């Protein structure tokens, strides 16, 4: 009988909602209202990068805070050198359709994927000196949306098959698979300790997965549309979610509920990229209205705009040192803001 | 130290990028869309994951893609196809049960925010079966306003009313709201499709170039 299970679902949902409502004694904004504002944040572009033919979907900084890699829709993967604007490697892809990229923690390897349902791993430190394809991970059904390295032997991927998987680069087989979502999985992010990770789906739902166990520990709801971006607070006990209803939200793991909502009456466009700062005080969000915004993470007040792009902003990243910001767009232009 | 080597490497890579830019700009890309029952496989295999096919007409290179390995939800991976030259849209004219779904898909593609510049080339396949079905199920069952329609084929004039009524709905949706539509009547056994695609792409590019010089 499906009816009894459907009912048990709603009594359990009511119990969870009652517990969440009883647990909410106060609000974060009321406590944080006592601190002084940070004022106006004004950044100027310091570097611009050219060379791509088509739009840009993904990018990734290096752990040394000097190099980065970008993937473009014309079938190209270019590694830059942001200090002197020179560029070191240019790799042509097998398929022109690419949606994601990653850069290894040790800098030895790079990864890419897209509509071809195949994850490609490229070697940067070959004895000959050129870049050569090393491994093709296959087994997914839908397109790959995100991929992140754990070490030089493991990698976690999320597909449009409504699933996530953990691979073994040496053998190329899935050690563990994570299932439970209803729609497409859009993005993921690794914890600072690389022990747990969160994943957001097109069902307006986020989930917290454990890498070693393989089970879903807890889930978060509260949005009204598809979720496009997600990232951890640098402490590792909270994260921020951006959706297509033109609102950002802040969740915490321990309270298992929502803390703040970042929204305005002037915005009717969704968010495509979300990132934090080194100290966690600023939240950078990219929109479809060709601009970006900097929210005060403890006051929900906008403190600046980044209006240097004349098209949609797709990727946004912050260096590990918290000293520069990189913002891509559909113009085939990369911009560095300081 | 390494700055000279980096400058040499940058020059070497930029030469290859300049070489590849022309090859990228030479060819014309197309996206093929249709239903399961539609004979779009025959269309794409007549001139011969994601399946690509290449054909050359009058020393011009076309490259068209068919995506069939994904699921049935397409609101997310369609945004990648906002830079294609044209969208080929294959519709069966012999199935009255599933015509409303094709109409709704055409409307959704027409009104999409990221596809307000891409043009649609419409193919109405399966005319031979439509003629036999009409000459011998009645189309008035699924469309009341067909009782009040007047024509604007050669073997019988009763087929013309239906085969133009089916096209008038798509034309009405197209004209109800930059980009145009190009209807065509085609069968399964027909070799004129490549020339039609060539002419439609030529017209689209000519209009774009005319707008570039501000003659329109």
């Amino acid at each position, epitope marked *: 009988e499906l009816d009894q299970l459907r009912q048990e679902a709603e009594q359990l*949902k009511n119990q969870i909602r009652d517990a969440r409502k009883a647990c909410a004694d106060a609000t974060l904004s009321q406590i944080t209202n006592n601190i002084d504002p940070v004022g106006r944040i004004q950044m100027r572009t310091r570097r611009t990068l050219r060379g791509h033919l088509a739009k840009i979907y993904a990018m990734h900084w290096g752990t040394d805070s000097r190099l980065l890699v970008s993937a473009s829709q014309d079938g190209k993967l270019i590694i830059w050198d942001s200090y002197t604007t020179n560029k070191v490697h240019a790799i042509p892809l097998r398929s022109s359709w690419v949606m994601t990229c990653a850069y290894a923690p040790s800098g030895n390897y790079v990864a890419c994927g897209g509509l071809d349902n195949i994850c490609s791993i490229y070697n940067l430190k070959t004895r000959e000196g050129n870049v050569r394809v090393s491994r093709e991970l296959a087994g997914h059904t839908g397109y790959l949306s995100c991929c992140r390295f754990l070490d030089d032997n493991q990698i976690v991927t999320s597909s449009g098959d409504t699933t996530c998987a953990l691979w073994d680069i040496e053998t190329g087989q899935q050690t563990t698979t994570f299932t439970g979502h209803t729609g497409d999985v859009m993005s993921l992010s690794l914890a600072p300790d690389t022990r747990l990770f969160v994943s957001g789906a097109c069902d*307006a739902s986020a989930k917290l997965w454990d890498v070693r166990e393989g089970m879903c520990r807890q889930t978060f709801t509260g949005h*009204e549309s598809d979720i496009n971006a997600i990232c951890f607070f640098p402490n590792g006990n909270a994260f921020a979610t951006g959706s297509d209803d033109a609102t950002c939200r802040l969740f915490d793991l321990r309270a298992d509920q929502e803390l703040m909502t970042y929204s305005h009456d002037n915005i009717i466009c969704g968010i495509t990229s979300v990132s934090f700062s080194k100290s966690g005080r600023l939240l950078l969000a990219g929109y479809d209205d060709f601009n970006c915004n900097v929210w005060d993470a403890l006051k929900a007040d906008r403190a600046g705009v980044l209006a240097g792009h004349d098209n949609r902003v797709s990727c946004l990243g912050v260096t590990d040192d918290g000293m520069a910001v990189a913002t891509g767009s559909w113009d085939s232009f990369l911009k560095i803001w300081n | 130290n390494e700055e000279k080597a980096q400058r040499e490497a940058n020059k070497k890579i930029e030469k290859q990028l300049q070489k590849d830019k022309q090859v990228y700009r030479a060819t014309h890309r197309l996206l093929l869309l249709g239903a399961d029952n539609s004979g779009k496989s025959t269309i794409v295999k007549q001139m011969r994951g994601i399946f690509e096919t290449k054909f050359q007409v009058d020393k011009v290179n076309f490259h068209m893609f068919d995506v069939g390995g994904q699921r049935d*939800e397409r609101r997310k991976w369609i945004q990648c196809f906002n830079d294609v030259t044209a969208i080929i849209f294959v519709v069966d004219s012999s199935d009255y049960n599933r015509l409303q779904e094709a109409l*709704n898909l055409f409307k959704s593609i*027409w009104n999409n925010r990221w596809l307000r510049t891409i043009s649609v080339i419409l193919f109405l396949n399966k005319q031979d079966l439509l003629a036999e079905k009409v000459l011998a199920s009645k189309i008035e069952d*699924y*469309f*009341p306003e067909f009782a009040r329609y007047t024509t604007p084929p050669g073997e019988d004039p009763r087929v013309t009313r239906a085969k133009y009524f089916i096209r008038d709905e798509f034309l009405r949706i197209s004209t109800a709201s930059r980009h145009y539509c190009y209807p065509h009547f085609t069968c399964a056994v027909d070799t004129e499709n490549a020339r039609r695609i060539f002419n439609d792409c030529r017209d689209i590019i000519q209009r774009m170039h005319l707008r570039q010089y501000e003659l329109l």
Partner: nanobody
Amino acid sequence: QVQLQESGGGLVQPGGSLRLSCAASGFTFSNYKMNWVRQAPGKGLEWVSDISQSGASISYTGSVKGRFTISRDNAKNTLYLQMNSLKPEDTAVYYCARCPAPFTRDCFDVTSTTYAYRGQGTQVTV
């Protein structure tokens, strides 16, 4: 969380009248365009009718024009459907759908087999 409950279906003789009512919770009503879909036994999902944000423009399918009417109520956050003179081929299960994104006049993947924003529906027999 988006939540949708449908009600009002039941047994009816041919030529009768029927009311279907849907209640929505968890989102703002007036920012979305609303859809009704139906599924007959041994058949796929079939689109019936839809209504825009404010109700200015409504659209119908071919086989129910002149017999069904659709309306929305933003104050009570509800949707309605009227059935008159039911044909024997109208027995099916009815769902109320929702536009995936606000401030849009297009709808993708509304009749898919695994859509997320839709109700459980009600059974209507003739």
